[PDB]
Design a protein around this ligand. Structure first.
Ligand code: GTP
Ligand code: GTP
Ligand code: GDP
Ligand code: GDP
Ligand code: MG
Ligand code: MG
Lengths: 431, 430, 430, 431
């Protein structure tokens, strides 16, 4: 187990990155100035021959505003200045700009850094990509990087965390175009994508957590724990270690179906923690309830195809088997017929850490679930419906066309998206 | 850094600009002499957006003040913030336009057009990454409508890629200030409808209403109306100047707001607006701001939005905020006012949040709406236009400046198409 | 939390409301400026029921004050508690109603109806779980009877599920204050008889009697009568504001009290009422309160209950209590006054107890009775109505405001049905 | 013997619950803050892995007023915040509201908690349900829960404590509708119901106790002792333990006759205690007198069908047999012919505890009787008479109809109630 490289693209990805790297530093004990006041922090950090550890990340954006905060923020000393790549003019929520016109200018600079980062790795498990599914830079430039990375690093894991457009909440008018276009250009190249919706996490903050005034500092901070659970196996020892490539081997039965949804348990406030045991069954049963999943799509509306329970902390393997056995016998919880075995257990010894000032309570035992469910097809369909509803009248096509993109690309994108919907239908039925 | 250059034409444009720079300079903590006396280091982080730094910490705004007669610009020099602008940027003529679009576009302003471009080009070169231009003027005046459109056409030919915003004061429905406004407005729109990317229509009648009832101001002067216009003008560019959780530059607003290229006429709004008497009795929270911005009583355009439908809407918040509240309130407006948005656009709201609030407020929001109700505004102007042009009411003044009558019918026909295009999209697929 | 919005129309409604909010604010320990200076934490537990919390601990009551002429509302501003209401809720017209239902319902008030709804809707949205509306007015006046019924019909169409209480001052039997009361009352009842869920009939004649003998007050002013009306008004909503052993919200009272939908006219009562001379000589215990509340001498309606029968009765107690005493005393009244209750309802008393007493009292009770004797009140008004309308005594004023004579006979016929329905249930199965 | 779950619904049930749980905590020694300053308190409590014990209860109401007191009361820390389920608008004493309109909205939230409570039980004896027979929430919502619980937990004990309308005292005008409607919907689902009348307990407080100013804090506190006696066998050891399911097997000869009445002895003030021996016969003979039963119906007017004497404290089994033998030879006390054996003895070692500030004296020996007597038919008949007396003229039917209920339901309810009266007639006669 050796390096995994994290690429944070766009305002969403970068703001998630600083939350993630703040979490990484605390777990390994690296101060905010990069000094290490033992042998496992090399996966995400490089020792600068002086006791100073540099994160193995490339922060890319087309606007200086977001990366300027990091340069002037508390973690200014942490990051290598050359890694913080920034553009001149934002993508203006336009996929075409982020991909063709302004994206092409800065793509080479990013690849130059990635190659230098990759060369200093004895082993390179893969790439983590943090981006927003809806947006100019976070969706147009990531498609460029996915295409560029694939040719150079074929058959290396390329994980991505994507902010899928919420079914009901939206913060931009042309998201359906941006989201569908990026899906077309990443389906063939990406290995698997962990989907999270802002609306779903907002609901958790109100019901599970007692925070009545959540902010993106809360969503990103909570989302950071998801990545920590996924990469804990690389960075820590424990029974049933789960490497990075085991995810694509287990959670992706077919090449085009690689969009597992995210779930995390427990998520409880400090006051509400005193009244709960939080045993292995207690946390485990929460992961399979609609009230806790981080995508607003209802899992009960469909069937599962694979799951990976990334247990963490003071947990006992026997209880994991017993709790999992109880889940499989539920009639309400349905697993597709052609997959007799759906669970991919993983256990780690390092408990989750407590971020000072956070809204999450100290838990000596936590579980993170990654599940590939056909219910996510209900999310693509709404995106498809929202697309042709605008494209029929050419709602905003002139902006995209003028940026060096052809109208035919819109037709191809939906046609590829239409097949993806059909694929989930085919896999969800058995004789 | 992202940079903008400000252009102000005519009495209306210059006087709005004067108040606009007072607001902008105050936020960044700039002394009237041009020195910086602010308290927060975050003000200088993006001061390059509007001000060119000169020797000795004297920040000079890159604004081009154009007026065919020295009168209005002369008062700006003697104003409280007169000594901040660069003297060479005061490109003033001698023979002022007689409130006719022809003189300000063909005969007199055409002689001064070359001089203005010299100043603008120097400013554009002074920038490292120019974003777009801003024009403040009135559609009913001669110099503003004439010189403003002449500038827009020229700079567009020289900066096709960049953006150009136009904060244009539009003739009021009931009370007018000039007799020949219909001719100027129709001709001016014919130029803006194809040369500018976004427009912020404002009318004095709506601003008078806001002061009368929404602010309980007994004696409103243009020292008061121009502040509301400036406040909205500052809100649109806050993301460029200051950081936030979800940012939106000028290009981001235009792409989201404009479905079709010719339907780029908007109507702005601002919140909170509260009288000192009613300030104590109202709570300042996101839910309260959302109701006011979508209230037809707060729009800065005479056209009532309820008479039409919204194609796209943008609300730019400022100050400490809660993203959940912003999304919930926008969700409420989306559902509650079900019929106020065209269905063929599944979601119409584009949100943006900035960390810094304006002046002493702890929270504020700026509203932008691409409603189809604005078709009513163009409808009235065309009706007034045809009423006069039917028998050449005041056409000899325009024809004597070199204009041809064929231009008036071309502008009329082009204007009529815009209303027809607006009416087409007010329909629904089912 | 459960929430109510208060509406007060006309001189009678506004002046009752002013005293009502003085009582309500005093119980919750609110300073006249709107600040909270109470001693018990239990006052803020349900302060959301009546007050919207503003910044700085300034609690603003969500009351809508409506009057077609500024006069009455102007005095409220200068009153002791004038500075607590929100200025924007003072929706006042200019041309006051001439004590004719037509003007306050069709011509003048119809122009102000839209403005009032704007204020009410904002209040309703400010609530998290709205329960119902309250209207205070007089049936003999023009604005109150006219505007009040116009408001009731409109809000009912917009809030069918919610409740609406109506504390209506009813014309006195012997001495009247207006010549044309019969026309206003009959028309007003025709609207209330089908649009409101519960009514609290009050008459000045009964209140004058209470002060004269039950309270030994030599010089009673409307500063005194409105306090008794307010005291009963506060009692009805005590369970919402404060906890108790057995609670009863507004909906609970209506369901128990109203057997049939059209028989929703009640007569209130209060206890203890004792003069300072007789205060020393009387013991304050549950048995003493029960006798007074059921005493015909204490009813706030002219109609003598003994002339009819009770369909349902509700006694809402307050303060430290003994449930056994409450049940025993109610059992005594049920048996002793055997013939005062209709048999076809086996039990007629709905009880409720609240922990907190009112003002300085250690114990209090509010009486509500759905007696059939109130048919006498409607009988007299119809007799007076037919006496005038038989030869169109004052009908030209109403017909000149747009009303048709056919409406008067429709109201008369509808009113006659109510008396007939009341008389039907005064009979017994055996 | 393992968990029994307590559901407290309505103002009556909740106010009874806080009296009951105050009693439970003192018996086991759990402080008011949930800390346990040994192996038998697990029936009604769950150990929160930290020395803090959470009651195994679900408090449900449609109005925040009653549950708000608990949240701000001394036992705020005791209850799990999620268990204290509260609605927005009360049921307004309307059965239709509590069942159809407002009940349907909050039913799912309750069942979600019950399922989580049930899962953490190795053994689930059954459910205790505290409610008022007359009232909106206490009668309309309980019918929903009974129907919902039955489908999920068939053949598990569902005990209920009901405040039957007093024959003479009444605090609401539409109780006959509410009481008859709930009886129809709970007769098929409920296992057995322990009936108590407020008027009957008021009489005891005046005659047996010397309290001239009783309050609901006295009735509920006294009623709490009834439940403690019933569940002492589960929570304590002693000769002739009586499990929860023995009640339904012994006290219910026929499925539709499951309404035993309540009786408790001794009930004496501190001063009056000094002048009484309070031997086993002394307390036992009191249970069979009209002056002490907690339902105003006169037992002498009918015949018994089964009885369960739940003795408690320093009691000797021989005296129990002798005292019971004396009762059976009484001619005035009559037992139905077809039940040669009527008594179900039960003895426990733990004496009743003394609630500080209470009106009950310290007794080292107590007895609680549950008896299924045909005399209770005199209580149903008065309810039936009070129903048709109003329904003939449609006294209040419009309120119920408007809330999504059909008029025909009223006819069916009385018809089912009419048969129940006939059943007691049939069982009460023998050749
Ligand atoms: N969870 C979360 N989502 C974010 C955050 N910041 C932005 N987003 C999401 O990003 C979506 C829009 O795309 P952005 O990422 O903001 O835009 P971008 O990636 O900078 O690309 P541009 O169009 O060039 O600005 C919004 O709908 C947000 O939901 C964040 O900090 N946390
Ligand atoms: N013994 C006893 N009875 C009570 C208590 N509280 C209420 N009751 C009885 O409950 C009956 C009325 O039903 P409630 O329980 O009060 O009403 P509810 O259950 O809250 O249902 P709603 O109609 O929605 O209010 C009254 O007749 C009382 O006798 C109590 O604390 N102890
Ligand atoms: N809002 C606003 N409008 C103004 C102001 N001054 C002038 N106007 C408008 O400008 C219009 C007159 O055109 P004007 O710009 O003065 O003519 P110009 O000098 O040739 O451009 C009038 O209709 C006014 O409504 C101002 O200070 N504020
Ligand atoms: N109890 C009470 N009744 C009042 C008061 N003021 C006016 N009234 C009654 O109101 C009636 C007159 O109607 P009014 O409301 O003044 O006319 P309006 O202004 O058009 O609604 C008279 O019969 C009075 O009995 C008051 O302060 N208290
Ligand atoms: Mg961006
Ligand atoms: Mg209740």
């Amino acid at each position: 187990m050796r390096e995994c490289l994290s690429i944070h693209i766009g305002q969403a990805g970068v703001q998630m990155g600083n939350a993630c790297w703040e979490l990484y530093c605390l777990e390994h004990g690296i101060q905010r100035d990069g000094i290490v006041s033992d042998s496992s922090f090399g996966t995400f950090f490089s020792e600068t021959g002086s006791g100073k550890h540099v994160p193995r990340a490339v922060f890319v954006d087309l606007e200086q505003t977001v990366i300027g905060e990091v340069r002037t923020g508390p973690y200014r000393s942490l990051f290598h200045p050359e890694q913080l790549i920034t553009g001149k003019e934002d993508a203006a929520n336009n996929y075409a700009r982020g991909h063709y016109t302004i994206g092409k200018e800065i793509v080479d600079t990013v690849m130059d850094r990635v190659r230098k980062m990759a060369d200093q790795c004895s082993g390179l498990q893969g790439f983590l990509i943090f981006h927003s599914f809806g947006g100019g830079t976070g969706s147009g430039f990531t498609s460029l990087l996915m295409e560029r990375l694939s040719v150079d690093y074929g058959k290396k894991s390329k994980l991505e965390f994507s902010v899928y457009p919420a079914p009901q909440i939206s913060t931009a008018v042309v998201e359906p175009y941006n989201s569908i276009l990026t899906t077309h250009t990443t389906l063939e190249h990406s290995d698997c994508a962990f989907m999270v919706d802002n609306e779903a996490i907002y609901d958790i903050c109100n019901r599970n957590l007692d925070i009545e005034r959540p902010t993106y500092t809360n969503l990103n901070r909570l989302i950071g724990q998801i990545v920590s659970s996924i990469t804990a196996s690389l960075r820590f020892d424990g029974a049933l270690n789960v490497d990075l490539t085991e995810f694509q081997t287990n959670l992706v039965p077919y090449p085009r179906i690689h969009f597992p949804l995210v779930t995390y348990s427990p998520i409880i406030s400090a006051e509400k923690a005193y009244h709960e045991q939080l045993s292995v069954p207690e946390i485990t049963n929460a992961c399979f309830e609609y009230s806790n999943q981080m995508v607003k799509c209802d899992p009960r509306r469909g069937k599962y195809m694979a799951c990976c329970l990334l247990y963490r902390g003071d947990v006992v393997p026997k209880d994991v088997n017993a709790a999992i056995a109880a889940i499989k016998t539920r009639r309400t919880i349905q697993f597709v017929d052609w997959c007799p075995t759906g669970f991919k257990v993983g256990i780690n010894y390092q408990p989750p850490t407590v971020v000072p000032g956070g809204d999450l309570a100290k838990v000596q035992r936590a579980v993170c679930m990654l599940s590939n469910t056909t219910a996510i097809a209900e999310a693509w369909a709404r995106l498809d419906h929202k697309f042709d509803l605008m494209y029929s009248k050419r709602a905003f096509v002139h902006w995209y066309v003028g940026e060096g993109m052809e109208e035919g690309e819109f037709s191809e994108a939906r046609e590829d998206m239409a097949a993806l919907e059909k694929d989930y239908e085919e896999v969800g039925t058995e004789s | 850094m992202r940079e903008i250059v400000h252009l102000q034409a005519g009495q209306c444009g210059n006087q709005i600009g004067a108040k606009f720079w007072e607001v902008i300079s105050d936020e960044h903590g700039i002394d009237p002499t041009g020195t910086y006396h602010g308290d927060s280091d975050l003000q200088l982080e993006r001061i390059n957006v509007y001000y060119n730094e000169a020797t000795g910490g004297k920040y000079v705004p890159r604004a081009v003040l154009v007026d065919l007669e020295p009168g209005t610009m002369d008062s700006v020099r003697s104003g409280p913030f007169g000594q901040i602008f660069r003297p060479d940027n005061f490109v003033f003529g001698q023979s002022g336009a007689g409130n006719n679009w022809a003189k300000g576009h063909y005969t007199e302003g055409a002689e001064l057009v070359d001089s203005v471009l010299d100043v603008v080009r120097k400013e554009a070169e002074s920038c490292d990454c120019l974003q777009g231009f801003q024009l403040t003027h009135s559609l009913g005046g001669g110099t503003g409508s004439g010189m403003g459109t002449l500038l827009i056409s020229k700079i567009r030919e020289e900066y096709p890629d960049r953006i150009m915003n136009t904060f244009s004061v539009v003739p009021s429905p009931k009370v007018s200030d000039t007799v020949v406004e219909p001719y100027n407005a129709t001709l001016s729109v014919h130029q803006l409808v194809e040369n500018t990317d976004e427009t912020y229509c404002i009318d004095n009648e709506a601003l008078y209403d806001i002061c009368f009832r929404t602010l309980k101001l007994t004696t409103p002067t243009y020292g008061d109306l121009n502040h509301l216009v400036s406040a909205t003008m500052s809100g649109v560019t806050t993301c460029l100047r200051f950081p936030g959780q979800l940012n939106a530059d000028l290009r981001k607003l235009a792409v989201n707001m404009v479905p079709f290229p010719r339907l780029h006429f908007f109507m702005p709004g601002f919140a909170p607006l509260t009288s000192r008497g009613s300030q104590q009795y109202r709570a300042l929270t996101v839910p309260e701001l959302t109701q006011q911005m979508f209230d037809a009583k707060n729009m800065m355009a005479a056209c009532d939005p309820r008479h039409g439908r919204y194609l796209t809407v943008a609300a730019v918040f400022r100050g400490r905020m809660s993203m959940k509240e912003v999304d919930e309130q926008m969700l409420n407006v989306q559902n509650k006012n079900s019929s106020y948005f065209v269905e063929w656009i599944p979601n119409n709201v584009k949100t943006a949040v900035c960390d810094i609030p304006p002046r002493g407020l702890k929270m504020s929001a700026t509203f932008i709406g691409n409603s189809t109700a604005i078709q009513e505004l163009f409808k009235r102007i065309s009706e007034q236009f045809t009423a006069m042009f039917r028998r050449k009411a005041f056409l000899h003044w325009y024809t004597g400046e070199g204009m041809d009558e064929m231009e008036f019918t071309e502008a009329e026909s082009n204007m009529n198409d815009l209303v027809s295009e607006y009416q087409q999209y007010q329909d629904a697929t089912a």
